[PDB]
Amino acid sequence: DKPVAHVVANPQAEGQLQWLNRGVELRDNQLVVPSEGLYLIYSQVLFKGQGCPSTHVLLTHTISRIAVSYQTKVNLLSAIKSPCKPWYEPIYLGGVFQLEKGDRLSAEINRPDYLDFAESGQVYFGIIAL
Amino acid sequence: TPSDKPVAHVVANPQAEGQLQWLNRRANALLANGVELRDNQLVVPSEGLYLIYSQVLFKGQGCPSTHVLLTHTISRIAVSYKVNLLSAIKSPCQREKPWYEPIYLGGVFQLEKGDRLSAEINRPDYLDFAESGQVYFGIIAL
Amino acid sequence: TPSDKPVAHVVANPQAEGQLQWLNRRANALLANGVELRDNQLVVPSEGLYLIYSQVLFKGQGCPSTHVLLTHTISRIAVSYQTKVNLLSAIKSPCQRETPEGAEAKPWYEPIYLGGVFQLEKGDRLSAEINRPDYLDFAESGQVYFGIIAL
Numbered sequence A: 001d002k003p004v005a006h007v008v009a010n011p012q013a014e015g016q017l018q019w020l021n022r023g024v025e026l027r028d029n030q031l032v033v034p035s036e037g038l039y040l041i042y043s044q045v046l047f048k049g050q051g052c053p054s055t056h057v058l059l060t061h062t063i064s065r066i067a068v069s070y071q072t073k074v075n076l077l078s079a080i081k082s083p084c085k086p087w088y089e090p091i092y093l094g095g096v097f098q099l100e101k102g103d104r105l106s107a108e109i110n111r112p113d114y115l116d117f118a119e120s121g122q123v124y125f126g127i128i129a130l
Numbered sequence B: 001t002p003s004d005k006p007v008a009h010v011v012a013n014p015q016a017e018g019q020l021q022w023l024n025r026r027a028n029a030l031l032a033n034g035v036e037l038r039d040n041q042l043v044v045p046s047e048g049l050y051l052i053y054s055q056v057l058f059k060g061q062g063c064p065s066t067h068v069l070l071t072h073t074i075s076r077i078a079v080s081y082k083v084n085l086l087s088a089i090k091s092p093c094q095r096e097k098p099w100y101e102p103i104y105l106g107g108v109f110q111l112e113k114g115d116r117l118s119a120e121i122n123r124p125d126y127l128d129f130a131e132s133g134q135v136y137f138g139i140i141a142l
Numbered sequence C: 001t002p003s004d005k006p007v008a009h010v011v012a013n014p015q016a017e018g019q020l021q022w023l024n025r026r027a028n029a030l031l032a033n034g035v036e037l038r039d040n041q042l043v044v045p046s047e048g049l050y051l052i053y054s055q056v057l058f059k060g061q062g063c064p065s066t067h068v069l070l071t072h073t074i075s076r077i078a079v080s081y082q083t084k085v086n087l088l089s090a091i092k093s094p095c096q097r098e099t100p101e102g103a104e105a106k107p108w109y110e111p112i113y114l115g116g117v118f119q120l121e122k123g124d125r126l127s128a129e130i131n132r133p134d135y136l137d138f139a140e141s142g143q144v145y146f147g148i149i150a151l
């Protein structure tokens, strides 16, 4: 009855955070809300890096909303992590939001080169209508 | 048919010296189906299982330098009454280049009507609200 | 029950020495809609997608003349074929600089959080485990927890 999606990262599409689906639709790597209502929005991304480079690294993960009404990319949930021997840093985001029919949501990262596809299928993004 | 489920997603006020002030009257912040924000606390409108979550983002310019202890805690106060539900501790400094430490807490809990919920930190001077979506507190009834 | 969804949030016993003992029989720790805590393990009551999460906090006063290794792991045991599989795991070395005696000991803190979404079948036993229970931190409560949320 309630619109739901749980998309995962494409392991084969390296150097990109490309969402793969298996009833909310996935259009242009974005989740499209099919009806007005309260939604649980969630995501996790797992980063890996062999040793620490001299350039100070910042790892960002963000869920953005492109409202049907005022067509502007707005951040709903966001986190920043400075991870600096191989290091491992997960980032997980989630909250409840009122969304209107036609809103496009995007789960994005700044460093796809640091994404860890090793434990992927644990790099996910999803929405659950309440 | 709107969901009648008690839900809340409050966010941090970026104009709060040495404090974390929860804001509901903002774009993409929410109080719904009976949830109340009173004295910086979330008030549960009915008995039930709830998802409780919170995220705080800490930022610090270089390592200056001592026991920089970062705590984030979600506490529960029953209708009679704090009692810690979720908590995390982080030391962002191992040495002495701005650092970033996010703290995300979440779980499922049985709560009774009238319980007050607070999301608190020890170092508000280290908070970061440069961009939106970085500091929040919420509850979702099941 | 307002929901028929299998959920659990168990917490660490601060009195069980040298071990990570999960509790549900405490305030702010629950088992619901079929989830069972049997032999320190969470028992899945039905096939489906579940959020599995665990947080553990380690504390140690000072970094001695050693290289310490901290592990945390979420394991799955399925009825079928008695299939034991590793779901989520983390390894952390809190010491990368040995504190020499002449200099004061500074206490270190290493939190480990594991979480993901997994397909589980009815009767699967899930375990959240650590290698060094002597390094666990009980200064405050709500730091060490294990839980599952059906989707």
Ligand SMILES: C[C@@H]1CN(c2ncc(-c3ccc4c(c3)N(Cc3cccnc3C#N)C(C)(C)C4=O)cn2)CCN1C(=O)CO
Pocket (backbone or CB within 6 Å): A040, A041, A042, A043, A044, A092, A093, A094, A095, A096, A128, A129, A130, B051, B052, B053, B105, B106, B107, B108, B140, B141, B142, C003, C005, C051, C115, C116, C117, C149, C150, C151
């Ligand atoms: C809301 C409930 C329960 N359901 C539910 N589904 C999925 C997740 C989910 C899945 C993965 C993730 C997830 C949340 N997380 C966020 C989080 C953790 C703990 C407590 N609250 C939150 C929130 N928001 C993180 C980012 C850590 C994660 O990896 C939680 N709950 C299904 C819908 N539902 C119903 O009642 C049905 O009507």
